[PDB]
């Protein structure tokens, strides 16, 4: 089945370049043009350009000419978008996608952050109720994911098998560091008697942490 796999997030210094890839499978590669699209935080979408794997021809949005260069490597079915002279204006999710009358398929996008600030792994802190407890109710637990750069982190609960009751809040940026929290709500009869664990992944620093929530010690 059709897949467009794009790599994970990129942090780049101002003035540098980045090359984002889009690996295609599950269909005949030359059947479809590959479109590239920019989504900046809270702005709309911008078509960057397209490339046609059949003949290698390219078409560019004039606003991106001189800045984006589209190539394909047919031997691995991979399209590439090279972006030079990067500034913070270029921080965005970059997408590749294909389409026809019959379907449209987008890749998951590659977040590119253009910043001078350094990568910093998160500190992960369990949030457990202060000695208060309750009977026959719900209990809300949490995880504080503090002091990291760049975005994103991913947070799951019990490796993602706890789904309902979960709120993961958008990170806040302060002085070159992000902080977010996540809460989970489970019946009081299931915790602390059954384990609840917060899983935090920070791909930019290759950080993976599991923080079990344990009752506060008085």
């Amino acid at each position: 089945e059709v897949q467009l796999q794009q790599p994970g997030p990129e942090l780049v210094k101002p003035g540098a370049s980045v090359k984002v890839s889009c690996k295609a499978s599950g269909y005949s590669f030359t059947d479809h043009n590959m479109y590239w699209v920019k989504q900046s935080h809270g702005k709309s979408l911008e078509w960057i350009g397209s490339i046609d794997p059949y003949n290698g021809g390219t078409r560019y949005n004039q606003k991106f000419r001189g800045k984006a260069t589209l190539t394909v490597d047919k031997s691995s079915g991979t399209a590439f978008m090279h972006l030079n002279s990067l500034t913070s204006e270029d921080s965005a999710v970059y997408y590749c996608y294909i389409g026809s009358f019959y379907f449209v398929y987008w890749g998951q996008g590659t977040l590119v952050t253009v910043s001078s600030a350094k990568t910093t792994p998160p500190s992960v802190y369990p949030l457990a109720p202060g000695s208060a407890a309750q009977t026959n109710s719900m209990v809300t637990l949490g995880c504080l994911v503090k002091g990291y750069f760049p975005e994103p982190v991913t947070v799951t609960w019990n490796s993602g098998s706890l789904s309902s009751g979960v709120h993961t809040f958008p990170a806040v940026l302060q002085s070159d560091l992000y902080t977010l929290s996540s809460s989970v709500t489970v019946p009081s009869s299931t915790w602390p008697s059954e384990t609840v664990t917060c899983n935090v992944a920070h791909p930019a620093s290759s950080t993976k942490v599991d923080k079990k929530i344990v009752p506060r010690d008085c």
Binding site: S44, A128, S131, C218
Partner: protein
Amino acid sequence: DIVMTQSPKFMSSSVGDRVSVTCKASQNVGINVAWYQQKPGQSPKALIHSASYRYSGVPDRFTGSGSGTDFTLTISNVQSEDLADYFCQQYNIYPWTFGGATKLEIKRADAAPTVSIFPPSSEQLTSGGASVVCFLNNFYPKDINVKWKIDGSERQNGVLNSWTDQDSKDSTYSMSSTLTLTKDEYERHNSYTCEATHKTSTSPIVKSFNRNEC
């Protein structure tokens, strides 16, 4: 370049109501207009091509109309899962261009926030910092205020707040509030209070702990 001007920017609808989003092109684009839905943290999903052709797998509650410059996406019998951004795109002429997103909120009965307060973890205390977290979960409508008190005194510096997108299941909102202090300031005071003020009540929901106190 064709400019696609979308309206309204925000729309609010009860389940079962009929919503419509309009998309006005600055020049004629025939019928080469598509409509997209994008839920938070997800890639865009095509709904409609050629202004009125629904894609395979899209519910029949989604319809498109219009030609030339005026285009309209209609959602009949709106469902809570339809909460998303929506936007149009013209692909009649290069460069292809997109309208700005319309955010659809689904209406629901008012709910008071569920408030919980959490003291700093011991592992954060060992590193010389102290963050106090308060969750205000699953409330409607989206407006809400939170106040911190330290030993009964209002505390305004050092607070950072964050708000979720509308919940896909129960159509509510949540907010997190974090008060961050040095370990020293945290250990110079005893009482820590989170207060939530929401239209569901004229009385704040108060939540507290003392730095001692089994």
